[PDB]
């Protein structure tokens, strides 16, 4: 069976302004099979009650999902997305960089 | 401009963990408008856009009936596919179906679609003629024979040329505030030194709708196709999208680079540069 | 709106 590893983007809905409420997004795309596990992390720890979109797919049949949570960025707080998938030997962590 | 309607369907088997999970979503252009999930507390098709909420209880009843029937046929189809491919009942498998239509600015049918994939690979597709089939392999050929015998393509042609177009027209009118509004990208270029002799120029497009966009970097007027890092267009979560394109440039040569942005929300393509 | 008629492969 064919397997496709997720592309992973971690980013905010609006340009980040310290002390201003925003949304932290993790967009996973281009993957197959559809089984995937995604956590959003604040300072290395899992954020509770993260929401996600309903499973949908692109023209090439590969899947995409958006995981999101409300957050208020600061200078010190580090955010990341952690993804597990059959294509990964270990969970992949992608750090939030407010310039990406 | 031109518009599309699409219904996407995914069933994923999970042997030993109950029956396959079924999720279907409907879109008009890049706007989600309906969803159904078989694992929901009390599964009904639910609205996901304001302009569909005005549809009466009869609309939702009929939609939910279709969704439940489709979940059931997907279950049967997953069993059928195990036979067609001589597979064991041990594994998880995936069945996907997309169908819908494209219409022009004047509402005429541009193209209809109806296609399936099994385990992420092409299975069978209705051709653009809405009359013949493309089967990916000898398994799909078995489906093709059954569907030719039952004159399935004729049924699909009737739906795609009729109800698909007509209901799309209706949705476009009812959602004309949003579906018929293009939001142009907000654009800027950022500069990040990598080293003493190299720097990254990143061209940003934000807050745009629909998702379709072209971002290109030129060096002395030449497209840099093969040297540009381009991220997949991504949802912001407020109905708009984001994208960037980056190039690594020799330091001191920044002004030889121009970012070019095309989007339907723009009267003409934009040219931008890094502004120190 | 969706197509009514069922289809199996």
Query: What is the secondary structure of B249-276 as a DSSP string?
Result: EETT-GGGEEEEEE-TTSSS-EEE----
Q: Where are the domains of chain A?
A: 1-100
Interface of chain C against chain B, CB under 8 Å? Answer: 1-9
A81 in Cβ contact with A10 (< 8 Å): yes
- What token pair was written down for A74? 């600061």
Question: Which element (helix H / strand E) includes B32?
Answer: strand B31-37
Count CB-CB contacts under 10 A for residue B235.
Answer: 20
Say yes or no: B93 and B213 in one domain. Answer: no
A1-100 CATH:
2.60.40.10
C-alpha distance across the termini of chain C, in Å: 22
Residue of B nearest to C3 (CA): B159
Chain B residues within an 8 Å CB radius of C9: 77, 80-81, 116, 123-124, 143, 146-147
B93 and B217 belong to one structural domain? no
> Which residue stretches of chain B are H helix?
57-84, 138-149, 152-159, 165-174, 176-179
Give me the number of domains chain B comprises: 2
Give chain C positions within 8 Å (CB) of B116. Answer: 9
Which structural technique was applied? Answer: X-ray
Q: Which residue has the tokens 């059959």?
A: A86
Query: Are B17 and B102 in a shared domain?
Result: yes
Q: How far apart are CA A99 and CA B246, in angstroms?
A: 12
Phi, psi of B115, deg, nearest 5: -145, 155
Q: How many residues does chain B have?
A: 276
Tell me the C-alpha distance between A9 and A31, whole Å. 13
Give resolution in angstroms.
1.7
Contact: C7, B152; criterion CB under 8 Å: yes
Q: Do both B270 and B169 map to the same domain?
A: no
Rounded CA separation B129/B147 (Å): 15
CA distance B233 to B230: 9
Residue B116 sits at the chain C interface (C-beta within 8 Å): yes
Which domain range does residue B9 map to?
1-181
B189 and B137: one domain? no
């Amino acid at each position: 069976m064919i397997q496709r590893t997720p592309k992973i983007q971690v980013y905010s809905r609006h340009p980040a302004e310290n002390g201003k409420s925003n949304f932290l997004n993790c967009y996973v795309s281009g993957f197959h099979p559809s089984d995937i596990e995604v956590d959003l992390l604040k300072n290395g720890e899992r954020i509770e009650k993260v929401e996600h979109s309903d499973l949908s797919f692109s023209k090439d049949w590969s899947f995409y999902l958006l995981y999101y949570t409300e957050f208020t960025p600061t200078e010190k707080d580090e955010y990341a997305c952690r993804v597990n998938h059959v294509t990964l030997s270990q969970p992949k962590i992608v750090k939030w960089d407010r310039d990406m | 401009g031109s518009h599309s309607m699409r219904y996407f369907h995914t069933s994923v088997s999970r042997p030993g963990r109950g029956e396959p999970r079924f999720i279907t979503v409907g879109y008009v252009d890049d706007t989600l408008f309906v969803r159904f999930d078989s694992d929901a507390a009390s599964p009904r098709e639910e609205p996901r856009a304001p302009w569909i909420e005005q549809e009466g209880p009869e609309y939702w009843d009929r939609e939910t009936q279709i969704c439940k029937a489709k979940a059931q046929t997907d279950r049967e189809d997953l069993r059928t596919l195990l036979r067609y491919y001589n597979q064991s009942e041990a594994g998880s498998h995936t069945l996907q179906n997309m169908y819908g239509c494209d219409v022009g600015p004047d509402g005429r049918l541009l193209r209809g679609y109806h296609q399936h994939a099994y385990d992420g690979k092409d299975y069978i597709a209705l051709n653009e003629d809405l009359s013949s089939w493309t089967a990916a392999d000898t398994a799909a050929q078995i489906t093709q024979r059954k569907w030719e015998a039952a004159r399935v393509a004729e049924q699909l042609r009737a739906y795609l040329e009729g109800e698909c177009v007509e209901w799309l027209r209706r949705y476009l009118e009812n959602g004309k505030e949003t579906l018929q509004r293009a939001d142009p990208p907000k654009t800027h270029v950022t500069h990040h030194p990598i080293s003493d002799h190299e720097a990254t120029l990143r061209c940003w497009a934000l807050g745009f709708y629909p998702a379709e966009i072209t971002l290109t970097w030129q060096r002395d007027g030449e497209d840099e196709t093969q040297d540009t890092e381009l991220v997949e267009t991504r949802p912001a979560g407020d109905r708009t999208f984001q994208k960037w394109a980056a190039v690594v440039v020799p330091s001191g040569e920044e002004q030889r680079y121009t970012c070019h942005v095309q989007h339907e929300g723009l009267p003409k393509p934009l040219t931008l540069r890094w502004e120190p | 709106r969706r197509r009514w008629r069922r289809l199996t492969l």
